[PDB]
Nucleic acid binder design. Structure first.
Ligand SMILES: [Mg+2]
Ligand SMILES: [Zn+2]
Ligand SMILES: [Zn+2]
Ligand SMILES: [Zn+2]
Lengths: 112, 131, 171, 97, 81, 650, 142, 262
DNA sequence: CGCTCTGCTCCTTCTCCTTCCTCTCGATGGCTATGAGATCAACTAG
RNA sequence: AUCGAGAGGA
DNA sequence: CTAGTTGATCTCATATTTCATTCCTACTCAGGAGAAGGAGCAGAGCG
C-alpha cells in the first residue's frame, strides 16, 4: 500500500508546478525506496547503510567512517558497481560496457 | 540577436564607440633581508600592450621597488558584454558594416540593435520611456 | 620429474593480423613461445602433447585497443624435479667447487659440500675433474645426482646435486 | 576544466561507458602499477631494467600483473594502508560461474 | 547455450555503437577490410558500410546477471537502427 | 613486460603487524629528515620513493616518474588504540569473557542461537552486543536449557566483568565489587579469542583479527603521499604528514627512554598518552574529545582523514570528479546559419586542441600535408608520435618539411570539420545538458550554436559560457556520434515531448509568414526557394496567377517540409474551413490550414517536429530545423518586426 | 589432478623413457602438420632430425636435453615399454613412485627402498623383488 | 543525493531491472518494457461514451437490422450477410471489447481516456490513406475473416519477452495487456470498414508497421534507467519542494499531516 | 499481595551536516649556537 | 608555491 | 706503486645569556533531526 500511496504523494509534488514527468521515472524511484521492506530514506542513515559495496557507499557522505567498517569486517567488493569501476578507471559494466565483443574466427576464415 | 545578444554597428566601433583603456600595474621586489640574500634586476643574462610608466622607489626599509604599468586598448569584439540601465544585459552577437544596417529615411543608422523579445518577458517598460 | 599437463596461455594478437591466416598465426606464436620455457610450479616445458586440436575458445578484443586476447589451452609435456629424488645426469662443465651438470632441461650445481669427504678437486686433471675417490666425475663421464630441493631463478631454474650417499654416485 | 560529479552522471545516463573511461584515464592520471596476486598490495619491486619482479613477504617471483589505475587511486590506497587498512586488489573473482 | 537464447535478436544501440567504434579502431590500425574501398577514407564510415551488409566478423556476449551468456553472431543480429 | 589485467574484486582488512614488518623496506628511527642535502638513512632514505633526478627509489630506478614509493616501518614502544576502532573495541570487549577468551554468552542460550544463525555478519554482531553487554558475569557453570539441573562449565574466568566506559583515548571499567584498562590487557584478551568467536563476531580469520585493532607498529607512507615541498626560495615547508610523524618519533623515542632509564612509572603514563595522542591526531585530528592537534603556524593538523572526508577529499574531489584536458571554455552566441548538430569553434582553439590520428593509406597523404602546415596554420598538427614514442614537436623543429610518415605513427592533428565534440553547460543538471556536436571552425573568439538547441542546454547569450570536450580515439568518437549526437536527443525521455523546437524570432516570424493574408511576390520567392538546400529546383505554381503571380506564405514554407508528412490537428473552431484560420493540417509536406505556431513547431508532443523524427529518423528532422530557420529568418529580415511603448498603451 | 578440459585426471607421472617416446610421437605429429602446411644411437639421431626440422635450431638447450634423456632412458623399445607399465601400475603403485622405477635402474627391493625413501616404509618388497629382476633383465635387453 | 540512490540501476538483457547487487527492483522496466522516448498521449476510445454509443460504433451484426453492415462497404455484400460463421467471430471479438471496456474502467477509476502509450496508431492509419491515395468511394476488398484474423495474428508477434517458459509467457501476456486493449479498440471491424475504408493492400501494410514500430519502443537492454530516472525528477525539482525534501528524507515528523475521508 | 525481575516507556544527552569558473591580497611557510684540531684518504709525481 | 579571507559571473 | 701535502671528515667546548609571558574584543550564528544510554516504572511471575 505504501508504494502506491507514496507515488501518489510524489505526483502531487511534481504536478504542483504543472510539469509532467513520465510515470516510469517516478515508478522506479518509489520502488527502490520499498524493495528493502520499508521506507528506506535516501539520506545518509537510510539507503547508504545497505549491503552494497563500501566503495560505492563511501563516496556519498561518510568516507572514512565506512572504510573502517569495511576493513574491520574484512568486507569484500565485487567491483560490479559503476562507481567502483570509475574509482579504478575501468570500463563500467553499463551501456556499451554491459557485454563483451569476441571475434568470429570461423566467419573470418570463411570471409576470404 | 535572438536571445539577449545584440548586433552592434561595426563602423560605430571604428569611430571609437565604447573604446576603453586598460591599465595594469606590476610590482616587483628587489630581494629579502640582507641576511645573506641578494638579488637584482640589471638585465640578468642567460598580456599585450606597451609600458606607460616605470616607477622606481624604496620602501622604508630601503629595499628597491619597481612598479611597471602597461596600458592596452580594449575594442569591443564579438561577445563583449554590455547592459542598459534597466538590467537588460547581453553580449555582442555580431557586427555589421554601416551600409548593411537598416536606416531611416533621414540617413540615421543604428549603432546597436536589440531584440523585441527582451522587452515583454522582462517587464522593463522604463527602458522604453528612456529611449 | 616428467609429466603431461594441460596449460593455458593468454596470448594477444595485434589487430593487423586479423586476416584469415590468424588461426595458424596464433598457432605459430604459441609454438615459438611455449618451447623452452621455465616455471617454478612445473619446472621446464619441453613440448606440447597433442599439437593438433588447438583450443582457441574465441578471442576477446581489449576495450583499450583492437588487439585480441586468446586464452589458449594446450596439453604439454614438462619436467618437474622434486626433493629427495634419484637422478641420472651428465656433466657439462667442471668447477673447482663442484660441477655444472645437466639434468635433461635442468642445470644442477653439484656442490663440493655434498660430495663424499674422500672426493677432492684435482687441478691437474684435464678436464679439472674429481679423481681423489671412486666417484670420478668429469664432462665426458656420466653422473647420478640427488635433488635436495629446487632453486628458482629469473633467467632459468637450477637445483642441487648430491653425491655423498650410498646411491646416485658417479656413472 | 573540471569534470564534475553531475557531468559524469550525464555520461552514465547516455550509456557512454567507453568515453567516460577516456575522460577519467587518458585525459589525466593514467598510471601503470604492479600487484602481487598472492597479496593484492602495491609492494612489487619492478626492476624493469633487469626485467625482475618480487614481493618481499610473499617471496613471489612468478605472480605479477600490470594494472592501470588513476594516480589518485594509487594515492587513495596508500593512505588506506597508512591507517592499517589493506585494500587487496585481486584480478580474479572468487565465484567462477 | 546456443539453444533457446532468450535475448532479442535485435541489435541494441549500445552494441551498434560499440561494434562500430571497435571496427573503426581496427581499420585505423590497418586491419583487413572486407568490402570494396570507394574512396571513403573515414574508418568509421567504412565500419558503417561493413555493418550495412553484415561483414563484421564479431560475436556479442550478452552477460545475464547470473553470469551465463549468449554468443550472438552479428550476422544473425537484426540491425534496425 | 609483465602481464596486464583488470581489477575484479577488492578485499579490505587490517594489516597484520607481521605483514607490515615484512613489506616495509626500511625501519624509521630518526625524526630528522636531512645534513645539508643528504637524508637521514632512517627517514625518507633513497630506499623510499626517490626525489627527482635520482634513479634509485630503492633500486627501482625509473626515477620518480613511473615508480611509486615503498612503505616504511615504525615499531611503537607500546600498543596504542586505533581511533576509528575505539567504538568497536568497546563493543567487542563488552562481549568477551574478560581475561578468559570466550564469549560471555553461548549457543546454549536460545537467543544466541537466533543471533548465531544470522547470515549478515554486521547485524549478527550488533544483536550479540546488545545481549552480551548486559551479561555482567562470565560464570563457569551455565544451566542448560535442555536440562535446567545440568550446568555447562563454560566460563574459564568464572568471575565478573566490569562496566566499560569510553574516556577520550582510554577505556575505564567499573568493577561490580574500577580502574583504567591497559592497552596490553586487551591484546592479551584478544590473543585468547578463538577462531570460532571471530566469525560469531563477524571478523575474518586471515583478513581481520581483533588483535589487529590495536596498533603496535605504524606504516610510514612514502614521500609521494607527502610530497617534497620547495614552494619558496629553496625552503622546504614539508607537508603536515612529515612533520606530524616526526612528533611521533620524538614521542616514541622519548617513551622508550623513560622505561629504559629508571622507569619512572608515573612519568611513563603521561608520555604514553602523548604517543597515543599524536597517533590519534595523525590518524584523525577530528574527535569528540577537545584535544586538537595544531601546527606550529597554528593551523590545525591536516590529518589523513581530512584528506578524504567531505568534498575536496581524494574521493570526491579527485576521483569521482577530476580536472581533465583536451577541453576548452568560452562564451556562446547564436547563429541561424548553422545547423543543429554543428557548432562554431574559434580557430584560436582548433589550433590548440588536437586529435591523435593514426597514419594509414586512407589518410597518409592528407596527414602528410597537415604536418607540412605546422602548428600555426589551422589545418595542421602539433606533434608526430613515432612507433618508439618520439613525440617530434613541429613547433621547435624544421623537420615538418623533412619528415616522411610511417604507417602506425600517430599525428596530433588539429580539430577539423565534422570532428565530434561534447558540449556541457554547468550545471549539467540532466541528460540533455550534455550533447555531441559536429565541428565547424569560425574566425572569432566565441562558440556558435544554432538557436533551437539552447533550450535543452537551458543556455542563453547574455554572457553564459559552455565547456567543450574532445574525444581522443577512433572509438570514443563513434560512441559520441552514435549515442550523444544532438538529433538523437530530439525526443526527451523526461516527458515524451520534444525538448527542442522553434524559439524566439523564428517562431514569431513563422506565424506572420503563414497567415491567410501574407502574399509573396515572385522575386522575393526565388531567393527564399534558394535558401532551402532541400529544394529540388522546382518552383511551385503560385496560388494566384492571372492578375499577377503571387505566392501565399504557406506555399513557400511547405517547400522545406519533407514529402510524405501528414499532420492533422483540429481545435474547437477547425471545421474543414477554419474561419478563424486555427487548427493545423498538412498533406505530403503541403500546408493547408492554420497559423504555424507553438502547437505545431514548438515543444508539443504532436507538433511537426515530433512527427518528422519518426517518419524519416532523427538525421532528417535535424535538417528540418535549419531549413525552416533559413526560410523564415530570410523572410523576416525583409519584413522586419519591432515593439514599442505605444504597444503597451491602451 | 585436474586438466583444463574439466576432467579430473590423475597426476600423469610420465616415465622418462615413455616421456621420450611421447616426445617423438609429438615431433612426428608436428612433422606431419608442417608437411600439410630402438637403441641409444638410433634414437639420438632421430630426435635431432625431428627437433632440427621442428624449429630453427635455436632451442639448443632442449636439444642437449633430449640426447641426455636419450642417453639415460631405461626402456627404449616402445613395445617392451608397454610391458613395464602394468608391472608397476597394476600393482597399485603411486604414479609418482611408478615414474622413477620405470625411468631408473634397480635390481633388488632394498636398493629401490634405499633409493626411494617413500617406498622404504610401505612397499611390499616381494612385489619389488619380482618386478626388478624382470625389469633388470628387460633393461639389459636394450 | 537522489542520483546516488539510483546511481547503478540498469536494465539487463532479461528485461529485468537490477542494481549492482543483483536485487530485482522491477521484473519489467516501467511495468511495460517500453522505452520512454517512444510514448505519446493517445486516447482510449473504448472507455468513454454511453453503453449504446460504444455499441453503435463497434457492434456488427450480419443477421439483424440494428447493426447490419452496409453491403457496399466491401466488394462482397449480401454474401457476407446472414453468415453465422462470421457472425460468431463478431460475437467473440465484441465480447472481448466489452470485457476490455469493463476492465479498463476498473483500471482508470476517473474515466480519463488518454494515457501515454507506444506507437501512435492514428498516424499509421492516416499515413496509410495518403500513402497510395485510398479511394473512399469504392467498396473495399477486405473480409471479416481477414480483419479479425489479422488482429489476433498481430498480437502474438508483439514480443517484449522471449522466454518460452510458462512464467515468462504469462508475463508477456501481461506486458502488452493495455496496448493490445487499445489496438482492438482502434482496429474494430466496424470502424476498420466504415470510419477507415481501408483496402487489403492498406490493411496488410499497416499491420506490418505496427509490428515493426512497437518493437522499436522496446527498452534497450543496458539502459541506465536509475540515473536517467533520477535526473528526470531532479530537473523539474529546481524549477511544495520543502514537501519534496520532506519526502525523500522520510522525516517521520511531517509538517502538515492531514486525512481525507470519503 | 509484596518481591523481584525484566522489559517497556520515557527522558535527557550526543552526535553530524552541503555545480563550475575568474581574479586580487596576503600571510606564510623558521628557527637554531662557534669553527678548531687531528687523522685519514685522495690526488700527484718520481 | 601553499592556506585563509574576500569580490563576483554562468 | 708507493709516499708527499692537502682536502675531507669526525669529534667536541667555551658559552656567556637569555623566556614565559601581555589577554584580549566577543558576539551571535542555528537547529534539526537522529542515534544511544540511562532511569524510572509497571506489571508479570514468584515466595
Ligand atoms: Mg545566462
Ligand atoms: Zn605479495
Ligand atoms: Zn620503487
Ligand atoms: Zn575471562
Amino acid at each position: 500500500a505504501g508504494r502506491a500511496a507514496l507515488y501518489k504523494e510524489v505526483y502531487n509534488v511534481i504536478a504542483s508546478d504543472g510539469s509532467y514527468v513520465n510515470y516510469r521515472h517516478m515508478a522506479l524511484l518509489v520502488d527502490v525506496m520499498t524493495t528493502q521492506g520499508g521506507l528506506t530514506s535516501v539520506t545518509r542513515h537510510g539507503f547508504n547503510r545497505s549491503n552494497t559495496g563500501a566503495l560505492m557507499r563511501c563516496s556519498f557522505e561518510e568516507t572514512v567512517e565506512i572504510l573502517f567498517e569495511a576493513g574491520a569486517s574484512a568486507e569484500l567488493d565485487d567491483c560490479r558497481g559503476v562507481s567502483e569501476n570509475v574509482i579504478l578507471g575501468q570500463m563500467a559494466p553499463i551501456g556499451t560496457g554491459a557485454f563483451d565483443v569476441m571475434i568470429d574466427e570461423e566467419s573470418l576464415v570463411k570471409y576470404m | 540577436n535572438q536571445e539577449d545578444s545584440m548586433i552592434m554597428n561595426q563602423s560605430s566601433i571604428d569611430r571609437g564607440l565604447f573604446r576603453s583603456l586598460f591599465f595594469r600595474s606590476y610590482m616587483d621586489q628587489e630581494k629579502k633581508y640582507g641576511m645573506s640574500i641578494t638579488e637584482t634586476f640589471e638585465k640578468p643574462q642567460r598580456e599585450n600592450g606597451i609600458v606607460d610608466q616605470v616607477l622606481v622607489t624604496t620602501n622604508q626599509d630601503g629595499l628597491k621597488f619597481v612598479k611597471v604599468r602597461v596600458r592596452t586598448t580594449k575594442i569591443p569584439q564579438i561577445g563583449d558584454k554590455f547592459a542598459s540601465r534597466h538590467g537588460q544585459k547581453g553580449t555582442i552577437g555580431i557586427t555589421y558594416r554601416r551600409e548593411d544596417m537598416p536606416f531611416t529615411a533621414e540617413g540615421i543608422v543604428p549603432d546597436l540593435i536589440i531584440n523585441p523579445h527582451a522587452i515583454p518577458s522582462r517587464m522593463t517598460v522604463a527602458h522604453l520611456i528612456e529611449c | 620429474m616428467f609429466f603431461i599437463k594441460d596449460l593455458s596461455l593468454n596470448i594477444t594478437l595485434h589487430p593487423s593480423f586479423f586476416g584469415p591466416r590468424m588461426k595458424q598465426y596464433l598457432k605459430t606464436k604459441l609454438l615459438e613461445e611455449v618451447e623452452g620455457s621455465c616455471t617454478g610450479k612445473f619446472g621446464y616445458i619441453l613440448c606440447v602433447l597433442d599439437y593438433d586440436n588447438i583450443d582457441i575458445q574465441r578471442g576477446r578484443i581489449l576495450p583499450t585497443d583492437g588487439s585480441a586476447e586468446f586464452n589458449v589451452k594446450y596439453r604439454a609435456v614438462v619436467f618437474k624435479p622434486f626433493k629427495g629424488e634419484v637422478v641420472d645426469g651428465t656433466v657439462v662443465s667442471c668447477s673447482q667447487h663442484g660441477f655444472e651438470v645437466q639434468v635433461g632441461p635442468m642445470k644442477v650445481f653439484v656442490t663440493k659440500h655434498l660430495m663424499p669427504q674422500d672426493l677432492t678437486f684435482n687441478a691437474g686433471s684435464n678436464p679439472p675433474s674429481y679423481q681423489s675417490s671412486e666417484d670420478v666425475i668429469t664432462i665426458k663421464s656420466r653422473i647420478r645426482v640427488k635433488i635436495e630441493g629446487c632453486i628458482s631463478q629469473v633467467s632459468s631454474i637450477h637445483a642441487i646435486g648430491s653425491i655423498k650417499e650410498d646411491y646416485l654416485g658417479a656413472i | 576544466l573540471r569534470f564534475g560529479e553531475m557531468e559524469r552522471d550525464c555520461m552514465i545516463a547516455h550509456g557512454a561507458a567507453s568515453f567516460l573511461k577516456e575522460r577519467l584515464m587518458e585525459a589525466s592520471d593514467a598510471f601503470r602499477v604492479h600487484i602481487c596476486g598472492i597479496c593484492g598490495l602495491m609492494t612489487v619491486i619492478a626492476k624493469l631494467n633487469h626485467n625482475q619482479f618480487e614481493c618481499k613477504g610473499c617471496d613471489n617471483k612468478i605472480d605479477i600483473y600490470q594494472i592501470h589505475i588513476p594516480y589518485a587511486a594509487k594515492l587513495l590506497f596508500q593512505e588506506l594502508m597508512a591507517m592499517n587498512i589493506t585494500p587487496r586488489l585481486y584480478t580474479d573473482r572468487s565465484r567462477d560461474f | 547455450p546456443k539453444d533457446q537464447r532468450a535475448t532479442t535478436p535485435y541489435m541494441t544501440k549500445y552494441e551498434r555503437a560499440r561494434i562500430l567504434g571497435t571496427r573503426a579502431l581496427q581499420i585505423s590500425m590497418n586491419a583487413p577490410v572486407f568490402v570494396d574501398l570507394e574512396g571513403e577514407t573515414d574508418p568509421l564510415r567504412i565500419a558503417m558500410k561493413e555493418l550495412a551488409e553484415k561483414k563484421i566478423p564479431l560475436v556479442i556476449r550478452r552477460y545475464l546477471p547470473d553470469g551465463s551468456f549468449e554468443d550472438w553472431s552479428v550476422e544473425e543480429l537484426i540491425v534496425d537502427l | 613486460s609483465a602481464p596486464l589485467r583488470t581489477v575484479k574484486e577488492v578485499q579490505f582488512g587490517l594489516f597484520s603487524p607481521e605483514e607490515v614488518r615484512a613489506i616495509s623496506v626500511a625501519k624509521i628511527r630518526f625524526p630528522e629528515t636531512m645534513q645539508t642535502r643528504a637524508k637521514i638513512g632512517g627517514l625518507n632514505d633513497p630506499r623510499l620513493g626517490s626525489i627527482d633526478r635520482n634513479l634509485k627509489c630503492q633500486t627501482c630506478q625509473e626515477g620518480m616518474n613511473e615508480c611509486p614509493g615503498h612503505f616504511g616501518h615504525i615499531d611503537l614502544a607500546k600498543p596504542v588504540f586505533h581511533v576509528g576502532f575505539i567504538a568497536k573495541i568497546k563493543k567487542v570487549c563488552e562481549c568477551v569473557c574478560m581475561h578468559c577468551g570466550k564469549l560471555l554468552l553461548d549457543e546454549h542460550n536460545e537467543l544466541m542461537r537466533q543471533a548465531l544463525a544470522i547470515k549478515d555478519s554486521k547485524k549478527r554482531f550488533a544483536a550479540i552486543w546488545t545481549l552480551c553487554k548486559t551479561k555482567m558475569v562470565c560464570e563457569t557453570d551455565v544451566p542448560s536449557e535442555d536440562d535446567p539441573t545440568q550446568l555447562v562449565s563454560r566460563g574459564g574466568c568464572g568471575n565478573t566483568q566490569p562496566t566499560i566506559r569510553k574516556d577520550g583515548l582510554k577505556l575505564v571499567g567499573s568493577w561490580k565489587k574500577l580502574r583504567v584498562l591497559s592497552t596490553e590487557e586487551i591484546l592479551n584478551i584478544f590473543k585468547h579469542i578463538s577462531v570460532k568467536d571471530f566469525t560469531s563476531l563477524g571478523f575474518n580469520e586471515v583478513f581481520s583479527r581483533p588483535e589487529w585493532m590495536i596498533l603496535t607498529c605504524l606504516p610510514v607512507p612514502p614521500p609521494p603521499v607527502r610530497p617534497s615541498i620547495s614552494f619558496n626560495e629553496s625552503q622546504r615547508g614539508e607537508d603536515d604528514l612529515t612533520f606530524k610523524l616526526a612528533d611521533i618519533l620524538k614521542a616514541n623515542i622519548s617513551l622508550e627512554t623513560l622505561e629504559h632509564n629508571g622507569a619512572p612509572h608515573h612519568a611513563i603514563e603521561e608520555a604514553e598518552s602523548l604517543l597515543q595522542f599524536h597517533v590519534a591526531t595523525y590518524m584523525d585530528n577530528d574527535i569528540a574529545g577537545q584535544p586538537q592537534a595544531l601546527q606550529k603556524s597554528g593551523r590545525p593538523v591536516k590529518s589523513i582523514r581530512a584528506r578524504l572526508k567531505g568534498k575536496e577529499g581524494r574521493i570526491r574531489g579527485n576521483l569521482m570528479g577530476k580536472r581533465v584536458d583536451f577541453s576548452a571554455r568560452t562564451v556562446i552566441s547564436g547563429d541561424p546559419n548553422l545547423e543543429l548538430d554543428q557548432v562554431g569553434v574559434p580557430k584560436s582553439i582548433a589550433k590548440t586542441l588536437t586529435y591523435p590520428e593514426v597514419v594509414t593509406p586512407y589518410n597518409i597523404d592528407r596527414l602528410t600535408q597537415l604536418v607540412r602546415n605546422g602548428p600555426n596554420e589551422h589545418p595542421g598538427a602539433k606533434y608526430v608520435i613515432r612507433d618508439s614514442g618520439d613525440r617530434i614537436d613541429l613547433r621547435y623543429s624544421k623537420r615538418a618539411g623533412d619528415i616522411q610518415l610511417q604507417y602506425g605513427w600517430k599525428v596530433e592533428r588539429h580539430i577539423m570539420d565534422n570532428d565530434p565534440v561534447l558540449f556541457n553547460r554547468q550545471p549539467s543538471l540532466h541528460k540533455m545538458s550534455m550533447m555531441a556536436h559536429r565541428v565547424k571552425v569560425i574566425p572569432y573568439s566565441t562558440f556558435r550554436l544554432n538557436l533551437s538547441v539552447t533550450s535543452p542546454y537551458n543556455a542563453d547569450f547574455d554572457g553564459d559560457e559552455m565547456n567543450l570536450h574532445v574525444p581522443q580515439s577512433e572509438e570514443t568518437r563513434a560512441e559520441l556520434s552514435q549515442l550523444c549526437a544532438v538529433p538523437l536527443q530530439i525526443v526527451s525521455p523526461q516527458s515524451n515531448k520534444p525538448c527542442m523546437g522553434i524559439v524566439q524570432d523564428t517562431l514569431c516570424g513563422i506565424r506572420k509568414l503563414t497567415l491567410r493574408d501574407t502574399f509573396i511576390e515572385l522575386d522575393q520567392v526565388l531567393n527564399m526557394l534558394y535558401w532551402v538546400p532541400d529544394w529540388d529546383g522546382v518552383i511551385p505554381t503560385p496560388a494566384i496567377i492571372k492578375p499577377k503571380p503571387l505566392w501565399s506564405g504557406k506555399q513557400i514554407l511547405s517547400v522545406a517540409i519533407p514529402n510524405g508528412i501528414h499532420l492533422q490537428r483540429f481545435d474547437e473552431g477547425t471545421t474543414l474551413l477554419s474561419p478563424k484560420d486555427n487548427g493545423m493540417l498538412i498533406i505530403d509536406g503541403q500546408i493547408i490550414f492554420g497559423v504555424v505556431e507553438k502547437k505545431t513547431v514548438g515543444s508539443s508532443n504532436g507538433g511537426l517536429i515530433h512527427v518528422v523524427t519518426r517518419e524519416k529518423g532523427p538525421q532528417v528532422c535535424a535538417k528540418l530545423f535549419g531549413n525552416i530557420q533559413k526560410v523564415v529568418n530570410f523572410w523576416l529580415l525583409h519584413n522586419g518586426f519591432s515593439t514599442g511603448i505605444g504597444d503597451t498603451i491602451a | 589432478q585436474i586438466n583444463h578440459q574439466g576432467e579430473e585426471e590423475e597426476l600423469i607421472a610420465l616415465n622418462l623413457s615413455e616421456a621420450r617416446l611421447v616426445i617423438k610421437e609429438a615431433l612426428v605429429e608436428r612433422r606431419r602438420a608442417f608437411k600439410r602446411s630402438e637403441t641409444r644411437e638410433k634414437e639420438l639421431e632421430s630426435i635431432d632430425v625431428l627437433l632440427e626440422q621442428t624449429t630453427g635450431g635455436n632451442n639448443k638447450d632442449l636439444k642437449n636435453t633430449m640426447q641426455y634423456l636419450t642417453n639415460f632412458s631405461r626402456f627404449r623399445d616402445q613395445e617392451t615399454v608397454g610391458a613395464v607399465i602394468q608391472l608397476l601400475k597394476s600393482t597399485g603403485l603411486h604414479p609418482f613412485e611408478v615414474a622413477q622405477l620405470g625411468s631408473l635402474a634397480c635390481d633388488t627391493a632394498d636398493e629401490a627402498k634405499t633409493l626411494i625413501p617413500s617406498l622404504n616404509n610401505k612397499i611390499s618388497d616381494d612385489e619389488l623383488e619380482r618386478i626388478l629382476k624382470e625389469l633388470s633383465n628387460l633393461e639389459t635387453l636394450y | 543525493r537522489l542520483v546516488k540512490a539510483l546511481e547503478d540501476i540498469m536494465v539487463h538483457y532479461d528485461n529485468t531491472t537490477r542494481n549492482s547487487l543483483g536485487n530485482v527492483i522491477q521484473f519489467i522496466y516501467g511495468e511495460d518494457g517500453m522505452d520512454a522516448a517512444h510514448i505519446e498521449k493517445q486516447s482510449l476510445d473504448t472507455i468513454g461514451g454511453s453503453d449504446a454509443a460504444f455499441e453503435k460504433r463497434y457492434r456488427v451484426d450480419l443477421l439483424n437490422t440494428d447493426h447490419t453492415l452496409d453491403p457496399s462497404l466491401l466488394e462482397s455484400g449480401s454474401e457476407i450477410l446472414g453468415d453465422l460463421k462470421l457472425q460468431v467471430l463478431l460475437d467473440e471479438e465484441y465480447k472481448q471489447l466489452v470485457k476490455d471496456r469493463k476492465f479498463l474502467r476498473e483500471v482508470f477509476v476517473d474515466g480519463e481516456a488518454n494515457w501515454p502509450l507506444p506507437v501512435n496508431i492514428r498516424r499509421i492509419i492516416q499515413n496509410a490513406q495518403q500513402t497510395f491515395h485510398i479511394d473512399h468511394t469504392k467498396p473495399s476488398d477486405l473480409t471479416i475473416k481477414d480483419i479479425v484474423l489479422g488482429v489476433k495474428d498481430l498480437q502474438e508477434n508483439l514480443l517484449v519477452l522471449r522466454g518460452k517458459n510458462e512464467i515468462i509467457q504469462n508475463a508477456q501476456r501481461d506486458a502488452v495487456t493495455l496496448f493490445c486493449c487499445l489496438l482492438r479498440s482502434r482496429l474494430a471491424t466496424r470502424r476498420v470498414l466504415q470510419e477507415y475504408r481501408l483496402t487489403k493492400q492498406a490493411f496488410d501494410w499497416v499491420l506490418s508497421n505496427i509490428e515493426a514500430q512497437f518493437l522499436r519502443s522496446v527498452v534497450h537492454p543496458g539502459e541506465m534507467v536509475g540515473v536517467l530516472a533520477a535526473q528526470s525528477i531532479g530537473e523539474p525539482a529546481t524549477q511544495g519542494v520543502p514537501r519534496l525534501k520532506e519526502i525523500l528524507n522520510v522525516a517521520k515528523n511531517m509538517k502538515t499531516p492531514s486525512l481525507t475521508v470519503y
